[PDB]
Symmetry: C4
Subunit: 228 residues, 4 copies
């Protein structure tokens, strides 16, 4: 069990340090930077890679809304939920801090939103709170449908990391302009704690919406996918 919490901790750290750190260091670099596509690929590849490295140890959730959805689907014991959520939020916070220390090694850098998720005025594209809510619920619900589908016994072992990592990239290709893309309450919490201000005031949305999307995808999955 301690092995499983460490798997979640290192995994969520990798997710945030790789995804957010590609956003902070590289996305807007002049002439050669990696754009929304490269951040999207980054975040999907943190999940693909640690899903292969530690998924067979903890299940490789790396994401509170995943742990909730897999509990609602009856794949995962509700008794492990809270500990997993604590291990995950701790990895995110420790990654946010390592990124912070490294980022400021560049003289007079402006961290800005520091890859925090936001809506309205803090939506990259100026989309409303209601747009933010709907798209985070829809995308997280589908994220769980892919995770529950691709880890079902009808799918041969070993392919789920590819499915689930690249589904995370696809989710970023769709929604970065709307919310910078959360679908993961832990991945939103670390960056926001370093920004404070508006980032903390909007943080609730990125706990509430992914958790409702993850639970909804679980319920939908149960209705047509999980039975033999």
């Amino acid at each position: 069990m301690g092995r499983k919490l460490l798997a979640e901790f290192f995994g969520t750290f990798w997710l945030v340090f790789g995804g957010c750190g590609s956003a902070v260091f590289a996305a807007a670099f002049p002439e050669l930077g990696i754009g929304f596509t490269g951040v999207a690929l980054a975040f999907g590849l943190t999940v693909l890679t640690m899903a292969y490295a530690v998924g067979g140890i903890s299940g490789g959730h790396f994401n509170p809304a995943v742990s909730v959805g897999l509990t609602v689907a009856g794949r995962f014991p509700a008794s492990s939920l809270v500990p997993y959520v604590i291990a995950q939020v701790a990895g995110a916070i420790v990654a946010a801090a390592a990124l912070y220390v490294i980022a400021t090694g560049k003289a007079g850098i402006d961290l800005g939103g520091f890859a925090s998720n936001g809506y309205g005025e803090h939506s990259p594209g100026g989309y409303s709170l209601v747009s933010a809510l709907l798209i985070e619920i829809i995308l997280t619900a589908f994220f769980l449908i892919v995770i529950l589908g691709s880890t079902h016994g009808r799918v041969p072992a070993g392919f789920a990391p590819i499915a689930i990592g690249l589904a995370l990239t696809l989710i970023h290709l769709i929604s970065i302009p709307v919310t910078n893309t959360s679908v993961n309450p832990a991945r939103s919490t670390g960056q926001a704690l370093f920004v404070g201000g508006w980032a903390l005031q909007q943080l609730w949305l990125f706990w509430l919406a992914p958790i409702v999307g993850g639970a909804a995808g679980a319920v939908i999955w149960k209705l047509f996918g999980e039975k033999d």
Copy 2:
């Protein structure tokens, strides 16, 4: 053919999958393709469409067959992989999934007011081809691209290839198809995908829609006929 899952489950699978294909491929185009400085361009859209299929073919492919595409259902029927008796119900689940995804995209887009959605990721030709290509060019490239899409689907799901790899060959073939043809038609190869967007644009998009039923369905049947000639036995 035998039944492996009851029809309601296969139809929901097809409904949710085609919803994902349009919501993710058309959503990436509407929200992110042209975003100033950092937007994802034709490349990021092609990746997104391929990934909706790769990820839903893994998620529900084992339930319905994972068509998400009337042209694919038709091609597999012509190749003798799928029963004609399931054709019409699948096509209806797929077109319903695409219309509901278009509507969902629209609702989310209204949260950024005063914005012009332009063609709303609709397919088109002539003045409505991103590069000004003619109706004949559109017709040809949709026939050839959908035919090869069918040949990749049929060969990668054949028993001579190990289970589990199809979603990756099929989803990446769709990304490849958009890399080639977005400048020509915005890329259909999928009558349901063309239909939901066009119903919201109306006008020229409804008027040109016929072509993105006819060409993909012709190409899908042609791919299937070609495959049965050399690949299936």
Copy 3:
């Protein structure tokens, strides 16, 4: 055997119509075009996808220099070499022609080099004939090392298309500026026949260099990789 020639024909057609057609229609499209990266990804994905669809029928060479390298490696009967080369060059020519018909459906388009490979003045980056020669030999030799390695019995079945497709993308990411990237005599012949002029005068280089690279990679492979 007729099944195998048709596999090669459809395969090389897909390679050229997908790769070259991504170059002609999309690579330089204003604001949104796919650049050298998207052409590189295109060409690798034609091979990955048709290697899965028909590789188990003909071996999925799609490329005269592959057929030569696999013959030199003793993987493939020298008696099938010529027929495979004819089927491959025929797919390329028929794809070049379909691309031609479709491309000119755009009023007053300038086809330009029409994705032909070239060197010196016709190298995108102005690299010399000698640069062109060396990089086509090196990259084709490695292409065969990957193909022979990834289809060896020590590698589990089904992964070779991923290896070999993405190796082709990697080769394009390295060399498009130097020669537009051939590593495939058939893929160079179709486009050049439609351009004539300098494209025909340089065509020999793109037969000679990939065939020497493919044969060399086969010989190197035999020395350290092919034995149990």
Copy 4:
């Protein structure tokens, strides 16, 4: 540990693989990254480096273990996956492969005369960090990135994951590492890769080279130590 292939074959495998990693990752950077209008950028370089490893790990991974990287050989020794007695010979084959690839890139580049190769894809820090990041930033990010590279290599090659998927997790993890850190150090995580380029630039690149031996090797050992704590049993 038992012998599966004789040492000459393992060394040639490592030599050719590290040659490919530098020739393809550094070649893509030198020839294509900054090409006017169509160049491939930090994204295309990160993809290229990841793909040299994915494709050579499939091609010769089954012969030598597919390290291509002194930091990887060290990490696997510390994790008890590889014998210390093979360490020095591997590291020498890898550094030789990288120097010969640098030389090969150089020869090909001379065919476009009067050109400035700049840093020639060398790694660096401070003034020689593409984004001006300090020595401490460089050191930290190379330790953390190489440690995770080791954790992904160790977990994906563990017996609890099916054979054949490692080249894909390991090569894509390298692409991810470049997506994160090219702005900081140009991305090393690999002392042999840093060494060949720097020997051609001389000057500051030879002077800063120490850091791209020390940090990757420290991070590789740390990743291995962490892995043995929770992952291996």
